[PDB]
């Protein structure tokens, strides 16, 4: 009725969708961004890729959408679908690995005045720093910049909307844990050109990694091996009868250490941990190495151990006596006096190396835990 058909048709005719609500040569189209990650689905620190939930709150005004009693008078605020709207080519700077998912053909709301919001339920593919400094106990801050993609601060400008945590909807299924995250605004003008360039939202993800299951399995076969090597020390000094017997273990255990290496480097390759983490294992594991080789070479270190009728009796007794000598010689080879030395020599070494391994372990755990 009330100019019913005349209302609706007029609107279609003189209105070009593609036109950008440019208002004189100035303020650019003022458009603000506001991301609220509802939640995260999955991440790969190794490949620094994340699939996340984002509701993008996009705001801007088109004074061409203002109305009178025949549009606003009809029903204050209403639902108009996107299409007709000029969609900022939003883009995560050093990220952007994937298209915005569910950004397309959604709707928006127009007020009696004009103000419009476009907030389609997104979830997409991301790309943020993790560097080999993300899995640390001391984390790294995922630097993520967002802003207008192909338009300049003269044609348009993307601005921020508010502060909010990243652990606000951080995934509890993540193999990592959050410290804090902040985001502040910025305008990037380049010494290149004397012009005034796009605006941007810079995310900073500060989170520290490593789920604790890993922790237990690995350090215990170490104190495990510690005891066998501990036995590697005590077994010899309290019984050199199974030196070779332990030859076996030395084989079974470094190979155990070798195969643990396949498993945890793929972990290494599975998750990017700051290499300086690797040196822990480096000297630790390798002392199992230098100690053995010496301990067991030393274990090994030892030469071979690892009237007339009366005279008959004395030529015979003399035979038993110098072989008597001989027996004592090889025993004069494998002494039990210094195998005790190596026992405390290295156990203090191990309690040193060990407590030294615990050192930096404990130390930056004095930093991380904080």
């Amino acid at each position: 009725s009330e100019h019913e058909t005349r209302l609706v048709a007029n609107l279609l005719e003189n209105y070009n969708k593609v036109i950008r609500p440019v208002e004189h040569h100035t303020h650019f189209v003022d458009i603000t961004v506001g991301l609220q990650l509802i939640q995260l689905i999955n991440v790969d620190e190794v490949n620094q890729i994340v699939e996340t939930n984002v509701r993008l709150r996009q705001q801007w005004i088109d004074v061409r959408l203002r109305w009178n009693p025949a549009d606003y008078g009809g029903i204050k605020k209403i639902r108009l679908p996107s299409d007709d709207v000029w969609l900022p080519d939003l883009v995560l700077y050093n990220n952007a690995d994937g298209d915005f998912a569910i950004v397309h053909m959604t709707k928006l709301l127009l007020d009696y005045t004009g103000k419009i919001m476009w907030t389609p339920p997104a979830i997409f593919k991301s790309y943020c720093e993790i560097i080999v400094t993300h899995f640390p106990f001391d984390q790294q801050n995922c630097t993520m910049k967002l802003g207008i993609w192909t338009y300049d601060g003269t044609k348009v400008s993307i601005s921020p909307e508010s502060d909010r945590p990243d652990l606000s909807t951080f995934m509890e299924s993540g193999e990592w844990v959050m410290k804090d995250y902040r985001g502040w605004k910025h305008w990037v003008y380049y010494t290149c050109c004397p012009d005034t360039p796009y605006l941007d939202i810079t995310y900073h993800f500060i989170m520290q990694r490593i789920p604790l299951y890993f922790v237990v399995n690995v350090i215990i076969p170490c104190l495990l091996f510690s005891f066998l090597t501990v036995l590697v020390f005590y077994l010899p000094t309290d019984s050199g009868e199974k030196m070779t017997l332990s030859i076996s273990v030395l084989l079974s255990l470094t190979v155990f250490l070798l195969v643990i290496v396949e498993l945890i480097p793929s972990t290494s390759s599975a998750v990017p941990l700051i290499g300086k983490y690797m040196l822990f294992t480096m000297i630790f594991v390798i002392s199992s190495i230098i100690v053995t080789v010496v301990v067991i070479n030393t274990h090994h270190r030892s030469p071979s151990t690892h009237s007339a009728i009366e005279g008959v009796k004395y030529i015979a007794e003399h035979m038993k006596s110098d072989e008597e000598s001989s027996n004592a010689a090889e025993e004069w080879k494998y002494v039990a006096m210094v195998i005790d030395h190596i026992l405390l020599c290295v156990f203090m070494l191990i309690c040193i190396i060990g407590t030294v391994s615990v050192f930096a372990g404990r130390l930056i755990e004095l930093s991380q835990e904080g």
């Binding site: 593609v18 950008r20 040569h25 620094q48 080519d89 883009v91 952007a96 690995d97 560097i131 080999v132 192909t150 338009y151 003269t154 044609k155 030196m243 070779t244 030859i247 076996s248 030395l250 084989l251 470094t254 190979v255 070798l258 195969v259 290496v261 396949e262 290499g275 690797m278 480096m282 390798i286 190495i289 230098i290 080789v293 067991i296 070479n297 090994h300 270190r301 030892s302 030469p303 071979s304 151990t305 690892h306 009728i309 008959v312 030529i315 015979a316 035979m319």
Partner: protein
């Protein structure tokens, strides 16, 4: 200012698929350039890569220089993809995957008819890295790209620095490194005998890699391994009799470990590229380790066995003594360890040589290409 009429005027005559060619005998002036921003996948064994390229596209078409209502209004216009001549880009030698987000994006029409456009593109390509690129001397990645549509007698591409870079935004998480990026603008005439040249864009990228992490995983094990065998070698002189087999247990253990290595890193080179030089020293320094190793058992294999009524009976018993003595004597002339002791120093210096031959040469294959 005829703003409406002008728009409506040209659109009347506005021609889509026709190039802004003054006439037909001197082509149009097309500008292009690429700034690397992402080198996403380096599969050198197959010679392919994925990069987010800034396709800087530029050309001229005054078919739309405007008046006061559009040129003067703003010396800058952002008009839709589908609305002007568009270079369907691709890398002759590389692009093996149609560009992604490299097209259908907002272009730029200044006021005099200058056209600027720059979409980001993730796409696949195939540069060199043909049984080389793993050295210390690097194979220059040569990618030439051009429109795959028309040929230079109508289209002409331009470029700039051919001296200045790929490391401009070369990824920091790459297992490699770049040292120079040269680029030339050229005509079309290849080995295949094609004429009517369509100019293209050459992309040199001589880059370095090899930042070994596996190096000392390889270097300490071998020393531990060498020592282990040198244990096998010197440990015998120290070791008891129950050690011949002791030594054997090590061979078993030594190569269990060995081919396990042979299975580990061979995998390495198949998932990534390949090259034989570094490969030669390992397996053959490895085969020599094995060689003198089994040689050792063949050495701890070599040697023959070390692998009145009163007096008549006193006579004969004094014989078992001298008799068996002749026997234990056997042991003597058999196990007088000239070969073994010397075998230690045999492998020792041979060890030093194999090592020197190798690490000295590794010194060279890092020092010539240094």
């Amino acid at each position: 200012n005829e703003e409406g009429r002008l728009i409506e005027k040209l659109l009347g005559d506005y021609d889509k698929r026709i190039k802004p060619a003054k006439t037909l005998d001197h082509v149009i002036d097309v500008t292009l350039k690429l700034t690397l921003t992402n080198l996403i996948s380096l599969n050198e064994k197959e010679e392919a890569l994925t990069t987010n390229v800034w396709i800087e596209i530029q050309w001229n078409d005054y078919r739309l220089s405007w008046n006061t209502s559009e040129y003067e209004g703003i010396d800058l216009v952002r008009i839709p993809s589908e609305l002007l001549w568009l270079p369907d880009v691709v890398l002759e030698n590389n692009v093996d995957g149609q560009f992604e987000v490299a097209y259908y994006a907002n272009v730029l029409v200044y006021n005099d008819g200058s056209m600027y456009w720059l979409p980001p593109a993730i796409y696949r390509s195939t540069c060199p890295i043909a049984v080389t690129y793993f050295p210390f001397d690097w194979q220059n990645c040569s990618l030439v790209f051009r429109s795959q549509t028309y040929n230079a007698h109508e289209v002409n591409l331009q470029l700039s620095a051919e001296e200045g870079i790929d490391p401009e935004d070369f990824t920091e998480n790459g297992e490699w490194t770049i040292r120079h990026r040269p680029a030339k603008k050229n005509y079309n005439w290849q080995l295949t005998k094609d004429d009517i040249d369509f100019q293209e864009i050459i992309f040199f990228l001589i880059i370095q890699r090899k930042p070994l992490f596996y190096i000392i995983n390889i270097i300490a094990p071998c020393v531990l391994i060498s020592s282990l065998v040198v244990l096998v070698y010197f440990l015998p002189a120290q070791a008891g009799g129950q050690k011949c087999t002791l030594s054997i247990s090590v061979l078993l253990a030594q190569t269990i470990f060995l081919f396990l290595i042979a299975q580990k890193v061979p995998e390495t080179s198949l998932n990534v590229p390949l090259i034989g030089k570094y490969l030669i020293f390992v397996m053959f320094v490895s085969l020599v380790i094995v060689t003198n190793c089994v040689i050792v058992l063949n050495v701890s294999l070599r040697t023959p066995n070390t692998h009145s009524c009163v007096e008549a009976c006193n006579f004969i018993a004094k014989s078992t003594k001298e008799q068996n003595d002749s026997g234990s004597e056997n042991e003597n002339w058999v196990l007088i360890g000239k070969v073994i002791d010397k075998a230690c120093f045999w492998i020792a210096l041979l060890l030093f040589s194999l090592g020197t031959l190798a690490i000295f040469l590794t010194g060279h294959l890092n020092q010539v290409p240094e």
